[PDB]
Symmetry: C2
Subunit: 514 residues, 2 copies
């Protein structure tokens, strides 16, 4: 029982074969060093640390999804558009997970039912020097079967184990875990779930999804979507101490129960002062320094893992990195594309959630109007995206003559193609927002800065598309960059010099001559 | 091959057994008499006309879905809420249709491949004296297989056969047929489809659906939904002259090809004057007198039907009737409920599209806020409903202490629970609307009054819910109608007199004592 099928170790072997893996044997400190090195090389190749300070049994990998190109190469996609379309198709066609025996699951080689000190086995890290606690943010929640209406859910939840085998469990209001906890908020028994660490890359990719429940509602099969993404079923295994299932090919597994009504503070400082929304926790998805809140507790009852001599791998990652941004926004883009295609097929050409747009904060859709009867569909798309993606603050629609991956080109569209009196939608003022946005959280006023007091401003949908029938007046003409060859005029040396001095919007403008 | 399984004849037998069927042998005139009698008994029991003027082979039934109570009894539902929930569940769990042999399909007992005069076999009717043409509005389009991405579509399309075997084909912009025609607008071959008449009641129920493509996108299985609604698979049969499938248990079937680029006028008058949007056609779904437009043509190549001595039944119905309203708004309500449940489960308690709200015009959702973190979800629901239901003009959200079926109670909520400065949403001004709404169609100005020139005003979402935490101040208290018994004070005669003098909002207020 020591082989993961399409597991993280196979991905590491593939990275090493492609030359995309950077290893080191120097001992890395989980306190400020892993996240520091990840931010120094933000959006770069994966880094594998063989020696982690005070964790002789663990290896740490980071920047696994830092470069979207290497991720697309790992999953067999040509480019971002191909990835979006293939992931939408996978969302509509899940692969049912397969259950294997308890004696052939690689993640159950070692089963610790006592001596449950999570912080001794799972690597907790500190992101910034301003933090006080070391937290665990590498595990994905896994709920399979009756508690998810016969489907399966996988997603990240940050945990702070400050009571040995009991830690806080951060749940986004409105998410799948929030819906499960709300349905069972007044039950007598706790919710049995497991946290998986070092899972297969497809499971991480699908766990990044969130707040796309018009496409991935409660009862869907997220593990099935991961299996369809990886081209084969994901293996499940029955837990040892609870009635649930786990990812058999993970590296660590925490079995336990979620107590919805047993809420405790995430940090000792906030627990002392007894207020939420202040007292920094660590950097969050909106790009701001974090805050600490009360949260339900996760009561661990068993710690399963691979053979400790094999040094099971854990994937710790800073929040404000290209890694986390890719992990969330990839399936977010695919789900937004699927929704727009459901509403009216053939109009949306591409969807992109750039790193700068705060994974749950905004998105960009590219629409192509084929005739006069399709004019106005971009506004329906913007309103539907803002309403079906809770707390999304800025959705932008652009035409097909726009480079959706260049923020400079988007800014140009905003400057030249937006009528400020009619092209700025504010669909749902007073709806549900995201508490982690400081602009929204500051609307609490003098109340507790939690989700119970914030007041959403309604989002912002910007229609920066060209009106149909005015494509000649809004034409970005072309420069003759294909009609002349620089080799006829200069030598290779000068051409390389001039090319090396180029960066930014000019790279996009020179490719298209636009 | 002469038995429909759960067909229209079985429904007629059930109605007769329950005493819900009203028969007559007097010859009814399809010109102004069928629709006149249907409007005289709007929302009443089904009427079966055994003798139709100039149609010795046809029987006509009307008001089949006129009373929602008899429909719910036919399909085995307790009430409207049970119907909505069961139909949502059926939408999420379709039954795959079964294919039967060409020699056991009841609808293929007689196959006319020549002498194709549709108006001689299919009963065309005139709705109002202001019309000039007699049109066919009893058949549902049926597209199965490759042209619907492996799914199945059923829906109504009004046809005017003024060229013998070639008639106009009215397609709503944005609908499933519109999406199919747009995908194949420039193909060389025409689109093979069939029009079914006198279909099973579940197929009519599902064909009533429209503009709910976040729940029923292109590629879904609408015939599967009908089968799940009726509790058994719907039978299909291979066509005779085209490569397609039809409802085997129908009464008539028109096989042919849809020519998207071969557009002709629906009436001779509009064809002469050569303008669209004027020159009345017949009453439409918005409750206004109709207009005539250009439309693609349906080229019939075969007319299959049951044995002409059995007098196959046809279901002609006026547009502005409780029948049509039920037929559309039932699955509309179920799909809106499904969408609201996908966005955030447990908040929406009931969805109702009243007759007065112009099937595609508006809806009412009833929300119950369980805690402070759910305040504001009604606005997300309203925005999502307005954006994902093309051209919807008025969505209203009310609290759980409201009778969703009483328009007086909704008006009371509008009067007392709407802040005009913050509770009226206008989410998507300039989006896609419905051309058949005169308020929208008048925005064309001096252009052609078609879908290419209308300018949607953005819809209207009214949040008439009670803010969370103010349920004591917005409490409709109760009167003690359960604490006193009228028999102790008056005799049965006076009680019946007083009860007979009551009607309207007082019936709802007296049941709840509110
Ligand atoms: C809002 C909340 C939780 C509430 O807590 P509070 O505002 O303090 O109010 P409350 O809970 O004490 O009272 C409440 C009363 O409503 C009843 N009630 C309460 N809940 C339920 C329920 N589920 N079902 C049924 N009834 C319920 C109770 O009946 C009663 O509570 P009880 O009396 O029973 O105790 C509040 O604490 C709170 O954490 N905000 C912030 C939470 C939040 O945005 N995370 C987002 C996580 S994204 C994230 O990281 C991330 C994502 C991507 C990338 C990087 C990162 C990072 N890096
Ligand atoms: C808007 C339309 C159709 C357009 O027609 P027009 O405005 O006149 O413009 P157009 O078609 O001539 O030109 C167009 C140009 O865009 C290109 N193009 C056009 N279409 C396509 C396409 N599908 N795919 C790709 N390209 C396309 C062509 O390339 C070029 O056309 P071409 O040059 O090729 O000919 C226009 O006629 C029209 O009927 N409005 C009204 C239609 C409408 O609301 N029904 C709603 C039916 S609910 C109903 O009853 C009902 C429902 C429930 C209950 C009761 C009732 C009743 N009782
Ligand atoms: C990639 C990544 C994502 C998340 C988190 C982290 C990483 C690295 C932590 C470092 C652990 C910090 C936090 N954290 C986190 C979180 N969602 C929460 O509800 N709670 C959390 O504490 N998301 C977003 C999740 O990935 C979403 O999936 C979300 O949970 C909704 O998912 P779903 O219900 O729709 O399935
Ligand atoms: C119940 C009923 C419904 C409709 C119609 C009629 C009846 C009796 C006519 C009397 C024939 C007049 C017209 N007519 C009609 C129509 N939809 C159209 O696109 N075109 C039409 O000429 N709808 C609404 C349809 O029932 C919808 O299903 C619509 O077609 C979209 O359905 P879908 O694509 O989502 O599946
Ligand atoms: Ca992205
Ligand atoms: Ca209705
Ligand atoms: Fe989930
Ligand atoms: Fe614009
Ligand atoms: Fe359809
Ligand atoms: Fe209100
Ligand atoms: K997820
Ligand atoms: K339909």
């Amino acid at each position: 029982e020591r082989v993961g099928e399409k597991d993280l170790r196979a991905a590491l072997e593939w990275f090493r074969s492609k030359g995309y893996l950077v290893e080191t044997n120097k001992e890395v400190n989980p306190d400020l060093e892993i996240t520091g090195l990840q931010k120094i090389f933000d959006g770069s190749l994966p880094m594998l640390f063989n020696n982690v300070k005070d964790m002789p049994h663990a290896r740490a990998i980071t920047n696994l999804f830092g470069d979207i190109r290497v991720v697309e190469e790992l999953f067999g996609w040509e480019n971002s558009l191909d990835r979006v379309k293939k992931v939408a198709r996978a969302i509509d066609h899940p692969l049912k997970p397969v259950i294997i025996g308890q004696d052939e699951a690689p993640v159950q080689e070692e089963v610790l039912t006592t001596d449950l000190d999570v912080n001794k086995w799972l690597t907790a890290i500190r992101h910034t020097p301003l933090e006080t606690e070391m937290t665990i943010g590498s595990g994905i929640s896994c709920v399979v079967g009756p508690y998810f209406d016969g489907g399966s859910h996988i997603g990240y939840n940050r945990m702070n184990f400050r009571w040995g085998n009991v830690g806080t469990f951060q749940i986004s209001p409105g998410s799948h875990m929030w819906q499960v906890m709300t349905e069972h908020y007044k039950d007598d028994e706790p919710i049995p779930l497991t946290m998986c660490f070092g899972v297969p890359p497809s499971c991480t990719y699908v766990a990044g999804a969130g707040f796309d429940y018009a496409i991935l509602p409660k009862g869907c099969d997220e593990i099935g979507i991961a299996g369809a993404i990886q081209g084969s079923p994901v293996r499940l295994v029955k837990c040892r101490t609870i009635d649930a299932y786990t990812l058999a090919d993970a590296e660590y597994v925490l079995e336990g129960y979620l107590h919805p009504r047993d809420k405790r503070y995430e940090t000792a400082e906030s627990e002392a002062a007894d207020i939420q929304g202040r007292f920094h926790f660590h950097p969050e998805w909106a790009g701001y320094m974090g805050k600490a809140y009360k949260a339900p507790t996760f009561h661990v009852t068993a710690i399963t893992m691979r053979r400790r001599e094999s040094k099971p791998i854990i994937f710790p990652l800073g929040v404000h990195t290209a890694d986390d941004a890719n992990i969330d926004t990839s399936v977010r883009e695919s789900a937004i594309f699927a929704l727009c295609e459901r509403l009216q097929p053939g109009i949306v050409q591409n969807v992109h959630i750039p790193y700068c747009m705060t994974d749950w904060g905004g998105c960009i859709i590219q629409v192509k109007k084929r005739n006069q009867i399709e004019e106005g569909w971009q506004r329906n798309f913007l309103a539907a995206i803002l309403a079906c993606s809770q707390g999304m603050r800025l959705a932008i629609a652009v035409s097909e003559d726009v480079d959706i991956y260049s923020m400079d080109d988007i800014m140009w569209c905003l400057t030249t193609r937006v009528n400020p009196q009619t092209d700025i939608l504010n669909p749902l003022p007073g709806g549900r927002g995201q508490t982690f946005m400081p602009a929204e959280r500051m609307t609490s006023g003098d109340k507790q800065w939690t989700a119970s007091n914030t007041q959403f401003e309604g989002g912002m949908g910007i229609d920066a598309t060209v009106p149909y029938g005015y494509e000649s007046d809004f034409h970005r003409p072309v420069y003759g960059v294909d009609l002349v060859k620089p080799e006829n005029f200069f030598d290779a040396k000068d051409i390389d010099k001039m090319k090396s001095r180029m960066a930014g919007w000019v790279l996009s403008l020179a490719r298209t001559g636009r």
